[PDB]
Chain length 204, copies 8
């Protein structure tokens, strides 16, 4: 029937679009403590799984502000495309070149705002033949209407809507591949899971 | 794959349907301060991008009331079709004529109520072969159920659900085309963005 | 493109499924004051537009309770199928016979609970070739999850999700067909509209 | 048109995935009192309808914890696959073997978390040709975003989204098949229905 | 300890302040169907218990609009003070004179907006020595912040916050005083109670 | 300063007012699964701590319905006052005589609806000198406005607003008094605690 | 009884504390469109009623940012105290001296964040003998918990919780004092009122 | 008037009650990411201001679980009272002796669950003459009803309801006392503030 097009840690690249200091103030559909944790979780999983990662920003030398320091620090050697004008990152030639240079068929995309910086390149990438996976809990926007309208638009085009924990699990496939590593990622980003670990660890 | 059918500032017309004084009191799915800002934002972007715009009202000489003054004042030369009876604007011959006279393939539609004044002509237009883009945050209705039911119906038919900021960004494409102009539109309609500008401006 | 399959007052029948006194206590996804008004609005529009209407109940001589008095009183000559056991009304031969006897291609369906008494016959009817329109604001269920899951299932099958005011507007098409009649229906079921009428009437 | 692919009590198996003590603490999209009742309702209906049932857990000898006692106690002879590493149950050979051994075409799936333990095997099963029915109110996850993203993904693939009461009704088809039995299931899991029964019973 | 200052049907007057057609459009803290039902319930109970009732409006010949027709029709002989400018009804001499002429110590107050038309006269009345009971569910305002701030202010001054059903029960005291009358009031304004009545009646 | 007037298991009585099958359908401020669990938790703790308990109903032979079976079954020897007309239970002589016969200074009260069946007797009791503790999560009403207004009124009079778990902990004081007993109460009424217990037990 | 301590336009001063561009990004308990409108409404009413107004900022030459431009522009001659370190404005000598120099007994306070920049000086002022009125809808903070805790603290101390429209009406007292002026204030800050005005005006 | 009883960094002690790994799973009134951040923020501010801090746990060798690792690690020399049975920490002699040994008049309290582990000792402390400040956003419970009922009870007794950021600002008083220190605390626990800092720093 419909094939299950699942994330393959050897055929996926991560695109982090415009998670900038100024732009994050516009994010109100997901509260800040949760949003910050989710964005950092996504960066950590990209690093953990060793997925080619591409960073891009929009007019960072203005109100939009610089890329949040964590991402910059975490991916010092990753392609960093500071777009001076193109709103849709896919319209930037350097950006597309970097994406295609990863040689990956699957693109895991997250950024701000959801309906512009994520949706535009997601739609462009789908037209180009890529398998697109949107991390909806690591992408932010004005409110639930701007968010849900974007979800509808991306889903309609064929984008798979996923969340960071789901992304990590589909990529990892098996705990035995590295229990401690995945457990650390989860403990660092899911207070409830960390608590379960604490109790289990002190008891055993 | 699925082509990205994106807004083209040279191939799009804006249809503002029944944003009337009386009818706005029926809008309860989007709070008034946000709704007013969004509707005015849509009018401002239509003017900014110079998109052929069509205004229409339903039984304005009754409880429905007159078109909100801002729109009337902003588009004094635009086609203004006061429909005496047709609920679906597409059933009004003058309305369809005005729409087709714009010569635009893409129609950006917003109005009240979402499930009637927006959905009916959106569905009619899709049947006629137009590419329809619904501005969900500049369209209002009774509640979330009447709204979401309409979204489902329009999406099912092929309408692209968008929000005003997304619409502006897809139309503009590149900041460099006119930075100050887009920045002004954003500053006037996004308090958070205006604040970022204020801080940046006083510092630089 | 996709044809706009709109309600035709001459080709539509209304199916009111299990709006029973006991069963209404299970409805918690739509608050009671709004739900009661919406159900009565649907009955009033069915009567106003003279649409063949079919009433049905499930094990009414038990906890489920009798059909709410208003509907019984409003459609004294309509087919009334008290199903002794079949959960999906479409599984009741008398019910299907009554539906087909209306000779109508379009079926406007509402009832309780949304995911069972509305969804089951809606899906059965779609398989039989009928054009189905679900009145989502006149159908009730346990909570938003049971509701939204049902919406997804019905939409997936091809059901058009609509709300009562939208249904009335698509059926009427033109105010001039009978202004006072439609205005009365609206005034009786939309407090906000009634208020607009009051102000307009005392002023003119 | 689209066939109504409805649950058949003779052609359906139930898969209960990772409803573990530790993992249930991660469920925050559905409040605990409702979630517990729903999960137990699903187990009770599986038992009532005599549907082949498969239990599976993920790294139960760790923070994830043991399967909740109720399920273990209710299905002592059911296949119980304690997966030591595979996140997607479908990747476990014993699990798939047990599923296929039931000889059932329809799979009713529920578990935690929705977007991983339910979605992954649901998608895998759809690819294998099974008719999948997801019990959305007996599956739990972090929040509404992780949940709704998963719903979109499963629906997109062809999964039918259902809720436990709907599942029971589609399976039973007719009250007369066993009134007391279904009534007991409902009374035990729907406080509102139990109240209707109490009043009716004391009066009659 | 603190005395229970309860409503006495022989020492209470009802003040209905500014429930006008225009002003009701400003009420967004309580949805319209519920609000309409609650206001009409309060009018019905005032009439039922034969309580001296005072109607008052603010600049009714302007955007504020006329008093909702039902109240005017229900209390044709009640004092009706059309205030031409005084915002706080207590500042209008005719209004205060009317309140004092009732000879009642207890004042049941409701109106729109709650923080102005209800709060101002309630605070004035408390200063004057009256026992004030505010009907919070028959008073409307902009949002929950304007509402809750007013509740705090009124409660801080000593006003007793009540809701229409509670008001009716405190006034009635005993069902046996007139079962049918109170039952009718409840049936007409509480859909859930009406349903209970329908089931009970058809069975007995 | 202000003395901590805490629950004393030897000086407290429990008043369960009108938790009737019909009346529970009116409870919409607290969802049914949680509400049922909370009411049964209060009944369980009253039995566990051997507190003198008084059951009372209002017009049970009518739409209001019988007392929920569990309470009747749990307190077979408790005073059971079927009030034929008095809305405020304190106005019923048998009720007050029973309360006073317990000899308890502290009264733990819960019932439906909170603003009438709980608030009225609570206010009456406070006037009489009793220390009143309202169990807000085992008392139900129409919505949050009817609930919060009642809380304000009760708190204003001096009632202490508590919830069942807090009630249990304040009465118990020390785990060591009977660990297993309190643990069982908690396990039976708090799914999260039960899960903690399951994991801990299987591990130790 | 308790005196109604109402706003007197001749004995009130307005304190606008820290409505800075940077600090406004921290405000998430009230959405931005509404918040901006409310802050500007308060500034407009302060100017309209000619109330002595005091502007103050905290570390404006840093992340906190400059005062929003509108307030600066609207009150060019008002005392403007840039506090270099004192968090509670009352601890700044110039600030207190300015407040006392107004000679006003009543202080209308608003600012960000509500639990610090508003609450601290409000509590200080109350201790000093001033009558404090907090504008809760023109004060912003992190979330509803930080907000409601502050309301509790301020109310507990004796502050009167008000909202901008209520503030305007209490100060104005009578429409006839200047109908057009108050009407303009309302029209500019309440979309629903503006709509009422539009319909009324076009009709008359 | 009422004195402003403000936090004094030299006369305040911090009581962290039962923030245990198991018990945190019961916290559902505040989402986990925010709750974790708030608890860690309170621990950080207690350490920053060098306030005598007391850690206490309830039956930690059981389902309740161990104290979250961060608090243990942050306060290695703080009194740590493992209570073997006393639910209200004030009933534990070592606990009270430790509180009194600090010599502090003001007690900043936080813990889980708010209506038991925080409320009980807060009420006990108030009776003993202490000035109690409850950190409502670093205290967790089952839901909003259990939370708000506790707030009411604590406030009624005289406790001051505060939140961590407010606590930090009231203790600090002046930025100049140590700008970098307070800024770091804020940056580490308020993503919005951190973003403001990032933009400001890169620009200056």
């Amino acid at each position: 029937t419909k094939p299950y097009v699942r994330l393959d840690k050897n055929d996926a690249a991560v695109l982090l679009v415009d998670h900038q200091a100024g732009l994050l103030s516009l994010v109100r559909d997901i509260e800040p403590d949760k949003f910050k944790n989710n964005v950092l979780a996504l960066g950590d999983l990209a690093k953990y799984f060793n997925l080619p990662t591409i960073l891009t920003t929009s007019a960072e030398t203005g109100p939009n502000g610089p890329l949040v320091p964590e991402l910059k620090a975490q991916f010092p050697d990753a392609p960093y495309i500071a777009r001076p004008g193109n709103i849709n990152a896919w319209d930037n030639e350097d950006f597309v070149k970097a994406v295609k240079a990863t040689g990956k068929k699957q693109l895991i995309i997250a950024g701000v705002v959801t309906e512009v910086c994520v949706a535009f390149p997601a739609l462009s990438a789908i037209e180009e033949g890529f398998d697109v996976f949107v991390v909806t809990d690591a992408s932010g926007t004005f409110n639930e209407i701007t968010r849900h309208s974007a979800w509808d638009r991306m889903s309609q085009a064929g984008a798979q809507l996923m969340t960071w924990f789901g992304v990590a699990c589909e990529l990892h496939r098996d705990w035995r591949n590295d229990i401690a590593g995945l457990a650390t990622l989860f403990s660092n980003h899911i207070p409830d899971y960390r608590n379960l670990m604490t109790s289990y660890d002190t008891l055993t």
